[PDB]
């Protein structure tokens, strides 16, 4: 098992960056959208594309 240490490291210990992608997503691209749900139909014609 000590022969696979560096390999497991470069496999997952660095792969945590990929997990960091979903963090920003869940934090901003779906939580900050609370404004679209409160605006009148007159603003959905723009907020969707925005």
């Amino acid at each position: 098992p000590m022969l696979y240490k560096e390999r497991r490291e470069t496999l997952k210990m660095v792969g945590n960056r990929l997990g960091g992608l979903v963090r920003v997503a869940h934090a901003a691209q779906d939580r900050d959208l609370k404004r679209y749900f409160k605006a009148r139909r007159k603003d959905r014609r723009k907020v969707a594309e925005e």
């Binding site: 945590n16 992608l21 920003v24």
Partner: protein
């Protein structure tokens, strides 16, 4: 009456002077200025530590 109405209109004449002066004063072309701002942003990335 021919003399009274003439005197009356001659006395009314001067007031029309200042009335037209005020009318001209209302047409003076003047104005100010307006100015605004704005800012949009966008997140880039992030990683733990």
């Amino acid at each position: 009456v021919a003399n009274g109405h003439l005197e009356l209109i001659f006395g009314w004449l001067p007031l029309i002077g200042e009335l037209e002066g005020a009318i001209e004063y209302a047409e003076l072309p003047d104005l100010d200025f307006i100015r605004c701002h704005g800012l949009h942003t966008l997140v880039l990335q992030s990683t733990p530590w």
